[PDB]
Structure formats: structure tokens, C-alpha cells
Design a protein around this nucleic acid. Sequence first.
RNA 1: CCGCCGGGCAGCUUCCGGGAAACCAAAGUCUUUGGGUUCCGGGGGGAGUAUGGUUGCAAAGCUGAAACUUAAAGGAAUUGACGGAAGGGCACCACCAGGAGUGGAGCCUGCGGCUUAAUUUGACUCAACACGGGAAACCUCACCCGGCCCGGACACGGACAGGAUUGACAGAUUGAUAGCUCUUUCUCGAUUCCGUGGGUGGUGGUGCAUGGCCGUUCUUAGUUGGUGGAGCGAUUUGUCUGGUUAAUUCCGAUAACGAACGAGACUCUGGCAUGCUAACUAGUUACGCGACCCCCGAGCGGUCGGCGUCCCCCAACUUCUUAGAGGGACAAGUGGCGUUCAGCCACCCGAGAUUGAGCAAUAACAGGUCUGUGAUGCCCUUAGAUGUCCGGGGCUGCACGCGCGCUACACUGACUGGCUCAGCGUGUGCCUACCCUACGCCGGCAGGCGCGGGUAACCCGUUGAACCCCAUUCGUGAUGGGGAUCGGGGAUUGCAAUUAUUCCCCAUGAACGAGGAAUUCCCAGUAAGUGCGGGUCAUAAGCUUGCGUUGAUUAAGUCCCUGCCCUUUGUACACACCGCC
Lengths: 52, 71, 113
Amino acid sequence: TPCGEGSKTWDRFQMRIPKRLIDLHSPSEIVKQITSISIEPGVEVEVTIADA
Amino acid sequence: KKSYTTPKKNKHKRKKVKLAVLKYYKVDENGKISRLRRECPSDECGAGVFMASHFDRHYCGKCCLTYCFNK
Amino acid sequence: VRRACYGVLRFIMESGAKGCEVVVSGKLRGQRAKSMKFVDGLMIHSGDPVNYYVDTAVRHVLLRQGVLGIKVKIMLPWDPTGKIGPKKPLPDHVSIVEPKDEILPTTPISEQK
RNA sequence: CCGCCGGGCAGCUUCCGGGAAACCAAAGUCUUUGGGUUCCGGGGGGAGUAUGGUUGCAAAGCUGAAACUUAAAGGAAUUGACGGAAGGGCACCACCAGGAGUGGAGCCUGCGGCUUAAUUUGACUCAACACGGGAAACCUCACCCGGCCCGGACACGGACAGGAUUGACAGAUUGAUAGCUCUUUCUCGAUUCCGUGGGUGGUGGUGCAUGGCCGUUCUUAGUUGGUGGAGCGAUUUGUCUGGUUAAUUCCGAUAACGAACGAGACUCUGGCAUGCUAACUAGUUACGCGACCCCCGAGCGGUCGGCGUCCCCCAACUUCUUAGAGGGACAAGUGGCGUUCAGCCACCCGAGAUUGAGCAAUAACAGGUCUGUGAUGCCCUUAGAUGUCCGGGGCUGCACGCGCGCUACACUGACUGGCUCAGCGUGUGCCUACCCUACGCCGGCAGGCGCGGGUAACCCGUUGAACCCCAUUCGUGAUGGGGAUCGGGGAUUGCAAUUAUUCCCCAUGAACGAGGAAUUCCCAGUAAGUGCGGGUCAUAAGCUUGCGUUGAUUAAGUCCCUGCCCUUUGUACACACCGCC
Ligand SMILES: [Mg+2]
Ligand SMILES: [Mg+2]
Ligand SMILES: [Mg+2]
């Protein structure tokens, strides 16, 4: 309900967010190949350097 | 609702006075200007800044309108 | 209203729609509010299916009088051929591919290759 | 018994033909108008009245006006819709069988009222009442007692200079260091000011001027068309006697046949998956156990039981964790029952055909919403402004009334030791100034003061909880339950808490010993208790929405009340019985 009234019904607004992650060992080619390809839809990609 | 009676004391919207202001400038014989009365301490109001006699007030008007004292 | 929304409804079907509807709620040449609804073809009105099949769209319209609502609600026939239409089946709908061949009882015989 | 015949009482059936229609061998032969003849109606009432006449013992009978008023009254059939009609069917917003309560007390806050300057205000059965996310000091906020401020767009007019008054540091004041105003004047300097039209807002007005969004009739089974078939035609069948079904869902009888929306299918979810893909942002698992390792403990010692760690890892793995692909469960088998169809019931293997929501048609309703909307019609109002605010105040006020909550009434319990089991979340560093919190001291405590991790599956955080569970008091005393109302301190948030902000520490220490008339809630991991998150948050919840946790009794059917679906029927109702009269 906008405003007050009517028998009290609510909605149950949901958004999921699954995280995958993949470890690897490479140079600055294989990272910059594999990351820039396979992009496109609503997908965020992080790239950690090493360990921390 | 109510309809506003108003205690009969219809408050004044006031004019800031008319005033030509700059006639009182002592030109003693040839061209030279300086009278004396009370002064303000401000920077943009540099030394020339000038004061008064009212029912009390006195004010200084020269950091454009920034800075009137309390006298 | 009349000639216009038909002009729309005509179009959207002719374009290539499974079905469609238009609603023009609001005051309509009278101090009272009417609500008008001109409909055509097929339309599913429940399920998840609705979510990725109908193309709902509300828009107001502010006129020299007051305010109407448009509601266009088109049904997409990408069920036939999206290219791979998402799911394609409305889940109700099953397509049984037909016997095709299944010829010959005959006497036995053999062959070699 | 079987025929025929006349004239009698009657029946069915039909596209004669009639018939407004219902119907009618006759109401048939009627614009294709008249076989004979009798009576008799001309909108409704007034009125079958008044008056007159007559008959009668009289009730009364027969004959029988008008003024006036009146727009329909009426008839036949249609859908409605309601029956204190009838069959069928169904809902725990229904009942049964109960428990839990609720309705009683105190307290909370919701409204009503009174009171009050003000207690702004929307919301009025149900589908108004901890609802407007409505837990409000200040803001909120609109509202009152004031009081400031202008943020008067825009244009159109008016104002070159003896500078249009842009903008003014000590006092009179004022609340204010509001030049907002009463002299003084010292600068920006083309702004300014004053008209006119016109805006611009307005948590002003109107939700019967509207959009959207919502609520609901109503998670109830319903709704619709193409072609047929019926009706001159509105309409009607298809859309249904019965069995079935959560469900016009199905099969079948079947002037219908095959279709469409709703239901169903779907999505999310919730549970079987030593089956797969894996995972230092899970777990890890158990190792291998290589250890530290202290007798942590067993044991003379070998050896072992075990938390912790020393880990790391170039173990190994997914046994639980996680989340991807999968599978499965599908009335699937067998035995009843069943028109032996549609299915129903029981049992087998096993999750037995139903784990729980969201989505939800046609069509509605002055439901609610203009105060969620820079959605807004028109209206008001428009500078002294209902434009925006500062300060305060109110929204909290109190002889009464109702509404949702909590806590109790105690000993299956009360307070006194202790042991010890999560889940969904949540978190900083965020659109304008602001968290989550681990571990040190200090203090009783609120807390305080130290310091640490944390875009988080890492840090909080083996989320170390309450009931619960276990260890002692107490003895049925309004008692140690209960725990209101006040006395006094101390912290914290906040610029500020007076109008106890919130918290702590003291201190007082109430009614209630099971609730009068009523009435909602629901069947399985269900009611109840029980904390805990989230939402609300500077401060903060007795609010909701989720989450486990502990976990019952009982129905497993019926329509007995209330209310819903179809069918048949009646209906002077169609503002639909809360009607009409
Ligand atoms: Mg006749
Ligand atoms: Mg005739
Ligand atoms: Mg007449």
C-alpha cells in the first residue's frame, strides 16, 4: 500500500548476488586475455594481484 | 478554520529612511575632505569609516554590508 | 481515444504479436472517470511465465483537461521463434514431433555394406 | 381380445396456423379485414364512491356520475439479486473436538470522547483501531503562541548621479551578533527599489475532478469467445442430471464440435540424494598425524581418550559447509472400493499421489490514497503570504469509551550456583557525516577509559541463547510472583531531554490468586513459549517481518451457526432485502 489502508499486505523484494572465484597462476598476458574476453552482461570481475 | 482577528497593532513595514546622505562633507575653501565623529575598527572599512547619534545606534557600512558593531 | 488506440492495437498485432491489450483509464469527455479496454489475440495473466513474455508498459498522459493512463501490455510470440525463444514453451504447451517414418513390417530380408 | 362407427369427459405432439408473450386443435380460418348473433372495455385513481331510482325485514342487491388528481399503472416474457425455497457442493476470516487465548488487572501504545488556545491529521462494519511504515524533544510538522526570513521566477512597466540602496563591525532592542526595523553613515555598484500583469510554491482545498499504486468482492471457483444448434430478436446452448475433483478439473451422458483466459502447468521455496563438479572468502575431514605439548587426562611404561594448538603445507578430501550441474517423487506398484471410466481408499518400496508462498481472470467498488510520487484536474492562497523557517509549544495532554500488544497471576513454579546447543540476517568506512566491532586496563554498572580485524563465507564470529538443560533457596504467604507508581543518585545520545529521551545505580514498592456479557486460530514440525535478528534508529523500542529453538493437545468431518460456490425455483427486489411496501 501506498498510503494507509487495506488489510496489511507486503511484498517481499529480493535480489540475489552469487560469488564465484577462480584461483590461477599466469603472466600479464593470460590475465589480460581471459578477463577482457567473456565480459558482456551484468557481471563484475575483480583481479587480485597475489595472496593478500 | 478561524479567520485572523490580529491584536490591533499592525506592525510597521519600514523604509530604511529616504536620505540624500552625502551632503555633509566639509570642503574647506579648496578641495580637501575630512570631518570627525566616532569610528569603526574594520579593514575594508579603512579609517574613513564613519559614525553617529540616534536613539543610540551609530553603524559602519563598508565591508559592503558585512560588519555593524553593538552601540 | 477510439481511432487512436485501435491505430496502435491494429499496428502491434500486425507487427507480429501473439496478442495485446491497451487500457485508457481516466476522465473521458465527462466529469466522471471511465475506463476503456480494447483487446486482441492471446494473453497470459498469471505465473512466472508472464515475467519474460508480456511487455508491460504504463505511461500517463497530461492533457488540456486532466490525466489519463495508458497501459500497453503486449504478448510476445517469441514462443514460436525467439531465435531460441526463452524457454519457448509456455510450460502448458508441449510439441509432440510426429511418427515421420515408421514404414514397413514386411518379410525379413538382410543387406551388406 | 382385436377392429370400425357416432356423439362424451380428457391426454400427448408438431415450424398448420395462430399467438406481446406466456401459450392455444384450438386462442387456427384477421390489413388475404366482414357466417349469425348476444354481452361488454377504452390510461390509473377518485370509485364501484357520491347522489338519484329500485328490491330487500337487513347485510346488502341491482342501476350508477363528477371535481380532483395523476404520469405512468399494467401485461407478457430477460438478465440480475435476495428468499425465514429446494437439491448438490464448499471455507477453521465457520463450526464441531482444543488449546491457545482474547474479552477481567496493571502496564503499552491504537483509536473514541472530554479537556484543551493545541492536543494538526488521514482512516468509520466488516476488507478503520502498533494502520499512513504514524517508536514523533529540536527536524519531522502541516497544526498554535509567537516570531523571524523571503527563495516575489518571468516578463511588462518604474528607477543615468548631488550614486538606484547591492550589501553594514559598538547599542534601543529583540529571542536573535534577525541592519527585521528608529540616527550614522562608511561600500557592491547597474545590482537595486515601486507599479502591473503574472506566477511559485503550499504536508492548502477537493480521492464523488483524475493517473498510478494499492485495498477488497476474492487463492472464491469462476470467465470468455469461433463455428454449429435453439430462439423474429434481447438472448441461449456449448457453460451439465450423476460420479468425480483442492479446483465448468474430468469423463460421460451429450444440438454440440473443437478452442481461449482463470484454476492447473510455472517460479521461488522447503525438505531423499557416502551419486558428480569443485572450493585457504567453507569446511575442513580425517588423517599422515610429522608435531608443541603439558599428566589436559588414562595408564609403571609401552599405549590410549581428549580439547587446545604448531602449524603450515608442495596431505587429501569433500564425511557435514557452500553452491553449480543432476537425479528423483511421478497415485509410480499391489489389494480393496468405485458406472469397475474419472478416480477414491488401504498397503509396498519410500519424501506416498498434498512442505509453504508468489504469480492470480472477467468484472467490479465515490473502498483507500491528492500527505509515496517534479502524477495532477480544477479550485483556493499568494508577501502580513497556507511560499521556507527559528524558538518555543503541541501532536504525549485527562472525570470516561473502545482497538490491536506485553507481564502476571506462580511451585510442571519463583529467585540462588552452574552446562551448553543457530539462523535469517546485519554491519565501517554509506549523496554530505557519518558503523560493525574483536582484545587491554579503569569502574559496581550504565558505562568508562585503552588499544585491534572488517566491500566481509576472512573481522565481529566454533555468532559460545532462552526457554531449554542441568546445580542449590522457597514453601503455597498477593510471598521471593508480580512487579506498577513515585524518592533519590549516576552514565550515555544528543547544541538541547523541562514534556521521568535512552540507560544504569540505588530507594518506594501497586492491581492481578485465571477474569463478567461476548468472540479468533488452526491440523504437523502446526498451536504455545522462547530468544534472537532484520525493518524502524543520532538517540533508541511493548511495533511489526523473518529466523530458528523448545515443541504439545485435538478435528481429519460436517454444513449445526457465519459466510462462499454451482444448479432448479419463486420473486411487485434491478440504489438488488441495509430492498421494495
Ligand atoms: Mg381473442
Ligand atoms: Mg375484424
Ligand atoms: Mg378510465
